[PDB]
Structures are given as structure tokens and as C-alpha cells.
Amino acid sequence: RHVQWCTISHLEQKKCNDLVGSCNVPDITLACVYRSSTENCMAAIKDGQADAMFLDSGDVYKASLDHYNLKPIIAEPYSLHRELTKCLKHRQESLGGDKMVKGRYIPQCDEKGNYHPVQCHASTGYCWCVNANGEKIEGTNTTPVQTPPTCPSQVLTKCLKERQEALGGKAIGRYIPQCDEQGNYRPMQCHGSTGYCWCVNAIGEKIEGTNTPPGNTQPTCQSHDWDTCHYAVAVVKNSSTFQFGQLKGKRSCHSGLSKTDGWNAPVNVFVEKKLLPWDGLAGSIERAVSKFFSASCIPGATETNLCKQCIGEEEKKCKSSHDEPYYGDHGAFRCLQEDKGDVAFLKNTALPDEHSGVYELLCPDNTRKPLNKYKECNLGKVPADAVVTRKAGDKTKDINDFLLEAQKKKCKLFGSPHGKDLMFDDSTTHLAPLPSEIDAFFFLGVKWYNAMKALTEDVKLPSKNKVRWCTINKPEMMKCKDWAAVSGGAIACTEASCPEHCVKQILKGEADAVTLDVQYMYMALMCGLLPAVEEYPNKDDFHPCQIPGSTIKDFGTKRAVALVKKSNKDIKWNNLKGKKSCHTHVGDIPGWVIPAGLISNQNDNIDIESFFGESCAPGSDTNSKLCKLCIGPENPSTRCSLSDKEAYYGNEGAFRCLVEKGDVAFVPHTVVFANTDGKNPAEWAKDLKSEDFEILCLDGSRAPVTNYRGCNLSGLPPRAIVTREESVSDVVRILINQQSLYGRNGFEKDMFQMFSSAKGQNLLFNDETQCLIEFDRQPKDIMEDYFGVRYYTAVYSASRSAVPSELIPACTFKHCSNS
Ligand SMILES: NC1=N[C@@]23[C@@H](N1)[C@H](COC(=O)NCCCCCCNC(=O)c1ccc(C(=O)O)c(-c4c5ccc(=O)cc-5oc5cc(O)ccc45)c1)N=C(N)N2CCC3(O)O
Helix, strand or coil: EEEEECCCCHEEEEEEEEHHCCCCCCCCEEEEEEEECHHHHHHHCCCCCHHHHEEEEHHHHHHHHCCCCEEEEEEECCCCCCCCHHHHHHHHHHCCCCCCCCCCCCEEEECCCCCCCEEEEEECEEEEEEEECCCCCCCCCCCCCCCCCCCCCCCCHHHHHHHHHHHHHHEEEECCCEEEECCCCEEEECCCCCCCCCEECCCCCCCCCCCCCCCCCCCCCCCCCCCCEEEEEEEEECCCCCCCHHHCCCEECCCCCCCHHHHHHHHHHHHHHEEEEECCCCCCCCHHHHHHHHEEEEECCCCCCCCCCCCCEEEEEEEECCCCCCHHHHHHHHHHHHHCCCCEEEEHHHCCCCCCCCEEEEECCCCEEEEHHHHHHEEEEEECCCCEEECCCCHHHHHHHHHHHHHHHHCCCCCCCCCCCCCCCCCCCCECCCCCCCCHHHHCCHHHHHHHHHHCCCCCCCCCCCCEEEHHHHEHHHHHHHHHHHHHCCCCEECCCCCCHHHHHHHCCCCCCEEEEEHHHHHHHHHHCCCEEEEECCCCCHHHHCCCCCCCCCCCEEEEEEEECCCCCCCCCCCCCEEEECCCCCCHHHHEEEHHHHHHHCCCCCCCCHHCCCEEECCCCCCCCCCCCCCCCCCCCCCCCCEEEEHHHHHHHHHHHHHHHEEEEEEHHHHCCCCCCCCCCCCCCCCCCCCHEEECCCCCCCEEEEHCCCCCCCCCCCCEEEECCCHHHHHHHHHHHHHHHHHCCCCCCCCCCCCCCCCCCCCCCCCCCCCCECCCCCCCHHHHHHCCCCHHHHHHCCCCCCCCCCCCCCCCCCCCCCC
């Protein structure tokens, strides 16, 4: 296997060459491919001349466009503020679940708030080992009849790990970190041989401008500093006296035309303060900046005066390359240090370490402040930088494997004698893989993505009076174009292939609303969308639809229930183990998902196949225990099929299986009524009595089938129309108005019917929808708010950590954004 790294300069190629020598990763060989600039390397990677390069966040965005089609895959993890520990989060979440769901696992945290390596399930006596994230080491379960397992100790904190590694198994003359009680870095660190001291934040990163030689007083070190985002700054010499607002006509050094810290952040501020007579005139920004400064060095620029101060020899002058000595963060600082500029635009990680000196920060509030005050004297937080590769991802694994092994082996990735910031930022300490579905939008975050886009094109913002509806198939798209035609512009349409892609479009500002099945709301809520209105399906009460706002007696959603015959008097909820169960089919929420979640919650995620003695659940393996109850009609049937061929499939089918050969069936609450009291003509349901069956309650009691509102496994939440938080008010308003025209009682229901169609069934909305009711948002967790406490608990253990879609790690990726 091979990894071809693209380098942008002779210095960088030389460093990459050294690594080919000095870093030995078995199975994977590194090679280095030279190109003359960032852009030429991007094109090389798109063309397969190379596989990977490290890019500033500004180039990550540029690379993500169709010209190059690169994506970020690896970056240094960062942190915005201090968070609760996972174990304590988990404890709180699971203690806030539905107390009616008894015997749930509550994690055991230690005096530091971590997971005890041994975790146990009180109500079952089962114990197992966990990793630091509290996830079960599979294959370590021990039963109550045995002693708790012996589990390896948890991995040490970064500080105690660095401490132990520096000691190298028994210390002298080198830096050994000093740690506190909780195992985090002490704010003040000192070198035990040189007498130097400096500040670090809570994960051990050095605070620039704090390095203090012995015999000097140290700057104060902030404790509990968990803000590890990088900050764009403007650095100046203390021998000049101008303020930020007087920058017009000075000489400037920038890390580069396409760098966030060297271009986007300053230019953004220039524009907000109106120092730059430029608006949206798409007069380019570079041209406007060209009028602002007298002479600058801005690698990658074309205007002549914005290259006048660079000093690269011949063609290399003003190149986005280390061969231009003033390129990059350290190059811009060199350019100021050598007095070719009066101000340099770079980021805090490139500031001098030493407290004392001729340099300080130029704050946009027209004051100046010391180097170590960048957190309150800056031009904004900037996104992380990343290793990128082709969108296709053919080499992602090889690239990750190589960098994981090189870092384990401590190869010299993050410095070099040949110069600073070669291959990677010198300030980098660790590179981790990004979520697999991450793209530039989710990596940079919506605020920085739009801000970068806004510098290149006049981004017309879609109207707040128009709802762009997202459709998942052509019939829906056709019904939505009919809606647009009569809506008078209130409705437009977009096309996607599935509901999850609709969620993505709404997040990215390409659509405004979509209707989601329950099975997709967890993912949509985790990504930050909100219910706007919901489908009210109750045919027995139209009052909430006639008078909007009135109080709803029964939303009318289905209620999953445990159905048993009145004959079986021994079968309660707690003894369902090993019994005969009938399931409508695998994947059905009331017949499988809800029961699956409760059995899992209360029995250590033991397979539902193994839990029941024998069942019928169409869609399982024909040879399985869940299929032997199934009969299959005309015998070829095809037992355990997701068709009416199987006589136990569906709401009615599971009901048959119960009366025939089963102790319990899991079905919606409506199946019994619609199939007893002679409601089904078929023979087996020959006048079966509704008083012949009862439903199981979770407390071990029972109740007549009629009390399903108080004796159910869980009620389903209604389907919901979701949108962006800031668009909820608009969408509600537009939809309610449309409903007054084209709802079941709309004033123009002859023009168009929202809740039906000749083009197909359940297009956009469910055809059985009575109306859409505004979501009354309660002050509580949206998960609990939208799902209801019973469902949240039974299906998701009332946890914000389930990952039912791999989009979730990408859409919850945290950003380095401003306000
Ligand atoms: N924000 C928001 N949310 C709503 C709402 N607006 C709209 C519309 O929704 C509606 O239906 N409104 C119209 C009213 C029609 C009746 C519905 C009222 N049903 C309950 O309030 C309820 C739900 C779940 C459970 C549960 O089992 O946990 C219990 C319940 C208990 C909880 C803890 C406990 O120890 C004991 C409990 O004991 C019970 C005992 C019983 O005997 C019978 C029921 C319970 C009670 N849409 C949503 N998606 N929503 C989500 C949740 C929500 O309904 O609030």
C-alpha cells in the first residue's frame, strides 16, 4: 500500500522526503509529490497524481467546490467549553427516563466522573467491562452467579499519560508536565531544568505570549481554559501607534489570499466596520483591499500592490508556497518582523511564545493588548484545518492508517529543521479521523461556510414567505408542482432521493420543510431541526382542526400494546421470557421496535430472538426461532414473508397468530377492536369477543383492551414537519394559511387538496391526515418534548447518544464560530 503526499514547496518536499526515510510504518509506504502551489496540489489530488495534503480551512472550502471535489478527512480535535463528563451525562439522561420503564441500566461513575471500568445492571445482576466512553467491551458479560469481571484500568488523562511517557519508565533534564487532582494540566507549567515557566490551557496546549525566563514575573495563567479554538489576530510592533480603524494606507503582511486567518477574518471585519468601501458588488474584494492598503504581501494575490512586499525569488514571489519566505502564518510574522509591513494577519498559534518583546495585538475595538490576550483581542475564531482527499475516498483508510501509525511511533510529523509549518502546522499535536460523512459544510459549520461563500458571490437569500418543500420521489415532486401552481408563490419544490437527504438540504439552506416518519425524527432532532407542525390523524374528533388552538383530547396516534387472551392468567409483563410471541413484522414500530427496545432496556441487550421461546415475526430468517410459529395459504405461503402470503403478517396477521398459537401478540391498540365483535367476517375471527382479550401493563398488572391510553407499551408520536429553528415561525404561518385554503375544510378545496392525490398514496402528507397542528414547544429536552417520555425511554433509553444514522456524528460536529 502507498500514500502519495502532495507538497507545495521545496522546503516541504524536503521534510516529506525525510519522513519517507525516518518514519517506518509497516504495510504502508509514504511518497512525496512536488507541486508549486496549494492550488496545483489540489488539482494533483483531484487528478490522482497524489492522495493527500493538509489545507487551511479557507482552502478546505475552496477544495470542496466542483472544480476540485476534495473533502476533509483528518484534523486535530478541539474543544469550545468545558462539558459534563460522559458518565455523568449518561447518569442524568437515564435517570430522567420514564419511571414506568423499570429495571433500566444506570451507569456507575467514579469520584472523577468517569465510568468505573466494571459496569453492572442492578435488576439483572449482569456485569461487564467498558471503555472510557462507557461502551461495553463485547464478550465480557458475567452473570450474577459469578463474581464481577476483572477489567483493565481506564486510560490515563493526557497529562498523566504525558507524565508517564516523559518519565519513560524511570526523568532528568527534560520537561515533565505537572498535573492537578482531576488529572488535568496545572495552568502554570515550569521546565524543571531551565527554570522557564509558561501557561497552558486545560488540555496542555501552550498559551502564546506567556513563556517566562527564570527571574521574571509570570503573566497570570487562567484556570479551567477549555476554549481551544484558534483565533485570527492582527499583530503589530509596540514601536508604532496606529489603531485598527486607521489601517487604511498601511503596509500589511497576510498569511495568504485563501487563508481564513490571513484573508476572510480580516476582510470580514474590514467590511463590518465599513473601513472597506465594498459591499456585495461582485468590484472584487481583492481589488477593494488593493485600494485600502498601500503595499502588502498576500501570497496568491494578483493585484500588483498586494504582492509588492513579498520577497520570493523570480517566479516564486507571492506564491501560495513556502518558497515565498513571507507565506503562511510564520511568513506573515517574518514580514512584520523585518519591517516590510506594519501589521501581520495570522492566528494565535503563530504568535511568539515569549511574554516580553516588541510585539502586541491590534484589537478591532481600536485598542492594543498583549500577546497573551488574543482571546479578547482578535478578529474571530477560525475553523480547524484538515487533511483532505478526493470526495470518492479511495485512499481515506490508507491515509488514516498511515497517520495513526506514524503518531503511535512518534515520527517527526510536526516540526522540522528546514522550516516551520511544513506539511502540517507546527502547533499540531494530534490528528484524528473525522466522521465518515463529514464534508466541508459540516466540518467548517454553517456560519463559516456561508461567510466564506459570501466573499465570492452575491448569495441571494430565499424568501421567508416561501416554503421550499423537499420531495423524495417523482410523484411527490409532481404533486408539489401542482401545489406551487395554486399557491401563488407560497410553495416551491426541491428533489431528494430519501428523507435523510431532505434533512441535509434543509440544514444547508436548500429546502425549508419535509414530513418525516417517526423512524427519522431522532436523526433530525439530533442535527438541530425542530418540529414545526404535526400530522393530526384522529378521525373521531375534528375540533382541533376547526378551531385552531383548542385543547386536544386525544391526538389519536397508535398505541403499541401487549395483547394476550383472557384464558392465560399467569402471563404478566415480567415473565414474557421464553413465551410465544406474535409480531406484525420486523421493523414495524408498534410490533417490533417498541417491544424490542423495552426487552433490550431490561435484559442487557439480549437478542429478541433468544428472549422469546418461539414467535412469528415476518422478515426474520426462515430457520430462526422467530419464524417457526409462522404458517406461510395456497401451499407452494413462503413462511416469514413481508407479504400477505404469510397469514400472520400485519396487524390482523399478528392477531391470528395469537388466537391460534401464541401467548402474546405485539400490535397497535386498534387491531383487537377491528377484528373481534364479529368485525372480521373470516372464520377464525368468527364473532371473537373483544372482552376475551386484555393488554399487559408494564407494572405486571393487566387491563381490558379498552384502557390502552393508560396500559400500553408506548404511544407513538405523530409524524412531524421539520425545519430550521429560525424558520419555524415562517413555516407554521405559511402552512396554516395553505391549510385554510386546501385542507379538508379549506375555502378553496376545489382548487387543490393537500391531503390526497391521484398521483399516488401519501404524497408529501399522509392521506389520512386530518390537519396539521402547530407544535407547542415545551421548556424541556426536545427529544422528550417531541417523542414523549415513554417512547424516548423505550426506544432510545432516553439517551442523546444513539447513532441510528451515520449522518449524526457529522451534523453534530462542533464548530469554531462567532456571534
Ligand atoms: N410538546 C408536545 N408534546 C406533545 C404535544 N405537544 C403534541 C401533541 O401530542 C398530544 O397528544 N397532545 C394532545 C393531548 C392528547 C393526549 C396526549 C397526552 N398524553 C401524555 O401526556 C402522556 C404521554 C406519555 C406518557 C408515558 O407513558 O410516558 C404518559 C404517562 C406517564 C409518564 C410518566 C409516568 O411516571 C407516568 C406516566 O403515566 C401514565 C399513566 C397513564 O395511566 C396514562 C398515560 C401516562 C402521558 N405533539 C407531540 N409530539 N407531543 C409530544 C409529547 C406530548 O404529548 O406532550
